[PDB]
């Protein structure tokens, strides 16, 4: 089997490995459609995850089931359908306590690209079929699909994370693949005023069409006090941090009010303590709680967002800038993601 | 003064009352546009909160402030405002506990055409000035705002407390202006598919601009077997009552999945006892939580709701379908409120 | 093997089946303790669920894990464990919905005597031991952990339910031993004044030892006045429903002030509407939540609440009023529950 | 009128003011007695609030009015109550958003010895008399009376703040005062094992008294792998913080598992920056929600604390090691707490 791999920290290249064997309960799928996330990017050139020897790459997929194991019920070869970056044991504690993501530790729910091969090969191993895939309505377009998987259940979980309530005013910090759909999601849970911290142009303007009401661009002065001022010094209502280092935490706790929330869904590779300013933090009283989490995976979360996208909620093509095809071009696409040019948001490479 | 009120059960007529005075942190507001409620209807033809003599009608407003008390500071004369349906106590103990809507007793939050005289006067008084009313921006049109202060709260109150997860299939039971306001709710909440129950077709052509993506007749079939029939008998994750008589909530429960929520916005008036059917309600144990409460008000509440509008989240320009003009239309808007007719939703009368 | 059962609605006696065979994943226990459940005899003597023949009863047990799957790796043979009333297939849709009492259908969670043969036999079976199995400690006693399987979980998922907040005022209507678990479970909650609903002096007195402060007798006059005299006409902050018909519901309601809870644990049979009061319901606007579900299960609900007995938080000893050996007294044990002596709260047959 | 107050940073001792004069919804009260508060003392030699000139200190009274506004109607001279340090001003918009504690601004509600003169005088001023006091019944001692203020609301909102569940483990880090309650409100909100981190015999003792069951003296090994270890590698389910510095936050952080919460109450002088382990807290993803702000104040919330002890569900008493007679004392007591001697938990002086 061809498939795209880490060889060992800051080198890749296509490789080839044992087609997978479904067990029981698991599934076979052959790629249709696959994306690169920055994540593999720090994953490979900066050991974000420890090292890795001839591991396969890529989280993000929307296949056709090929395979699938005795005890499969629900999914059958030839079946079209999105498959989840996360996807959990389901009988696990922490599936008891409500956390799914971390099904037999901490961030154990995300296996593909970090304990088991990922989905860039000319076939993946999906665990336990029946709870981790989600049927592909024939309606919905390949390319937008592949959102699914993980840019829009993690742009999701940031609105969802913060508790919005209708007609509050919520920021978004990072306007990237992931702040976009951070910024749908504020809106689909009834954001007012929806604040976009960012500065690229091709992320500004899908920023708009998503919903973004105010543009906020660093390089004009200090985030704290440009929000302070939009908001005649009320601060916003939540917070959502889709990107940036370290810092960003103490903006966003500078600009959200007591009370407020400020719900994080990016992911920190620097440094080892993450800034919570103690003054703007009411000295530890400004009941401004502080949320952080990996997104969603499981069927029912993709089933969720399919029907957000066949209902036309929300349309994640907007996010798409380029489209590529073949498996040769998974390599095109990777390299793209490390190399942001200035037109790219999110790539993606049909496989026909 | 003049002003439209309820004589006695069953009668209504223009009468003569003293020009209200400001407390020390009350306003006098002189109304810019008004709507009928059924509720008056109800109030004054059916009596449905007891008997009254002589009470000015009318809850629904957008004025300017001609005169405040000593102690107003965020309200002058001359100032747009749109004033809350309920405008409560907020130094009580319910206030406390979180429920103004209940601020000194049950349902106390609401004053206007029940225990104070209603909008439909030469001038109107409006209680606790700074914590009741709400800045109008010039932007709003009228007929439009004047929908903020009943039918948006309760509407979206309605999405509010049917607790809806992303991508969650809501039912909307009742589709009149608040039915409406709960279908543009749901879909605020980030609801996914949205099935619209009602017959009126000015109604369901509001509906489906609203949000709805199925509508639901019950005349081609009982609600609860073609809901189950629209999701493969899955049901949907919650259902907002906003119209319908005691039976509706039976349907509710029904419908909604175990672990569903029945959110309820309506007011019943007849019988005694709302149907709860203990088979499809697990017998008590399907944790179908059922909710119902009276649409908050406040200048919080306006000001959230105030701002979907000003960010084109949400148009209620849709919901009024008739414009008239001068203080002499607030009783023929009266009337059409009582008698229905096939192309009237909201009718509102401008500049009065 | 030898097991009590249910031959058919209204006649049960001991038949004797096959020694059921663990799957990959479950287990076979030997019971070391059980007790007959209220439930067991609406069951049989009222068909609350239905027709069932050869239907081994009882659902309450404590044992000793005999024999387990080749896939279960938490638990070994000749482990002490507490077994859950609820064990349910954590492989379900609903289990992602977050209600395991429902996976696979409402109630479904709930199988021992209702869909599967009961643990009152020489040997019973429990699907997916590692997730619905949990050790018991030998400090704890048997006759204390039979109480933790059903009536602890359902009284403390009673006080769950109520969102009772600190000093908050409750009110149990029933005492029997689910109200009794349903009162501790309040004061587990931090409940300030607990108003315990019922005549029986047997439970009343295990009542106050629980953490009741007042008792009610119906026999005294109308519930709902003799609460209202209590709290000043004030009314409780929330209400559990441990018991009673479906008029319980309407007293419920009653007592409880506007934006309470009332949460209900109660098994209803009789009737096919449980009433709700639209008066004091606020015509569908006090904001009177209310709260109905199955008692949570598995292995993780029944080791939180074996630490809540393990560190003196809570004792159910007091629930078990008689204590009997062998299996011949299975059967007495039972009996002794449809004609409940004025002495009798919680039957438990020791050893087997 | 005589009080002891704050001249300048690193300076006290007594001065006079003019006795207070009521407004039309305020109240004056004589102290009956009062109780020093480690804040003050970093209030006044640390300046953690900034420099004041001749403000009267103290926030934890219980006392008598003595004159009420012509606008008050809940209480009159003579009546004896609790006064919560938290005397916020009810008619804000915080107020309307939930969070009365941030009443015109953040920990706005925190007004005795932060920007009005405290309790430590002769007579002192209670804004909104109604809203602000509750009535002190006799059958509880001053001595415990006084600890309901600051040390009961702040602790149990600690436990409140936490997300406990029924048969949760929490560890209390930082047994003082507050951290005490902060373990008894874990135990009012039903946690099971509670595992209180404390070096001080006194304050140990005190610990197990409230329902501690575990104690970690840091000088034995790192907290965090002491924590780990006591629990199986499991962590705990939530981490109150009462006490210590910026690092705490990282411990709290290192003993909570994915999905836990790091519920603070401390008030952190030291540093700009709160340390949040960004390995530990999941990069950013492990669920680990971290909560943290000033205790709710009221007349409501003494209410509750109130009957919480009246119905013998929790008794500060033991939180109270010393006690002393007249004011002159409030200055020997205020020193006490400078040079917290090994024997002292929280000093009260009697008889104002
Ligand atoms: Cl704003
Ligand atoms: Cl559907
Ligand atoms: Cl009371
Ligand atoms: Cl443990
Ligand atoms: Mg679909
Ligand atoms: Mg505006
Ligand atoms: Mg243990
Ligand atoms: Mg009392
Ligand atoms: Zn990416
Ligand atoms: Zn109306
Ligand atoms: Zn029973
Ligand atoms: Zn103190």
Redesign the interface.
Same mark, same amino acid.
């Given at each position: 089997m061809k498939g795209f791999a880490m060889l060992s920290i800051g080198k890749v290249g296509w490789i080839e490995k044992e087609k997978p064997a479904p067990g029981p309960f698991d599934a076979i799928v052959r790629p249709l459609a696959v994306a690169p996330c920055t994540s593999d990017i720090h994953t490979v050139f900066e050991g974000a995850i420890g090292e890795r020897h001839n591991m396969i790459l890529g989280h993000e997929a929307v296949g056709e089931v090929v395979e699938v194991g005795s005890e499969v019920k629900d999914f059958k070869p030839g079946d079209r359908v999105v498959v989840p970056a996360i996807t959990p044991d389901?009988?696990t504690?922490?599936?008891?306590?409500?956390?799914?993501?971390?099904s037999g530790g901490?961030?154990a729910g995300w296996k593909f690209s970090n304990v088991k091969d990922g989905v860039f090969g000319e076939f993946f191993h999906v665990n336990?079929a029946?709870?981790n895939l989600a049927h592909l309505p024939k309606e919905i377009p390949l390319e937008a699909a592949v959102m699914i998987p993980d840019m829009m259940t993690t742009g999701?979980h940031g609105?969802?994370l913060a508790d919005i309530?209708?007609?509050?005013?919520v920021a978004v910090l990072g306007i990237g693949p992931v702040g976009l759909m951070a910024v749908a %999601?504020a809106?689909?849970? =009834?954001?007012? !005023?929806?604040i976009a911290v960012g500065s690229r142009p091709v992320c500004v303007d899908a920023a708009k069409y998503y919903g973004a009401?105010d543009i906020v661009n660093y390089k004009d002065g200090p985030i704290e006090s440009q929000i302070m001022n939009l908001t005649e010094g009320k601060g916003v209502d939540a917070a959502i941090?889709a990107g940036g280092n370290?810092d960003i935490?103490?903006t966003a706790v500078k600009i959200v009010?007591?009370?407020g929330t400020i719900a994080?869904?990016?992911?920190?590779?620097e440094?080892?303590?993450?800034?919570?300013?103690?003054?703007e933090?009411?000295?530890?009283?400004?009941?401004?709680?502080?949320?952080? %989490?990996?997104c969603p995976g =499981?069927?029912? !979360?993709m089933?969720?967002?399919?029907?957000?996208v066949?209902?036309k909620?929300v349309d994640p093509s907007k996010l798409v800038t380029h489209v590529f095809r073949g498996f040769d071009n998974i390599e095109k696409a990777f390299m793209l993601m490390k190399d942001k040019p200035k037109d790219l948001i999110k790539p993606v490479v049909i496989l026909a």
């Open positions: 389901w009988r504690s922490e599936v008891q306590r409500g956390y799914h993501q971390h901490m961030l336990d029946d709870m999701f609105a969802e309530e209708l007609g509050a005013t %999601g809106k689909l849970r =009834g954001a007012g !005023r929806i009401t941090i370290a935490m103490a009010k007591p009370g994080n869904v990016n992911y920190f590779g440094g080892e303590v993450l800034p919570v300013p103690r003054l933090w009411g000295c530890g009283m400004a009941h401004k709680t502080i949320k952080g %989490g990996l =499981g069927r029912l !979360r089933e969720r967002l399919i029907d957000l066949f209902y909620r």
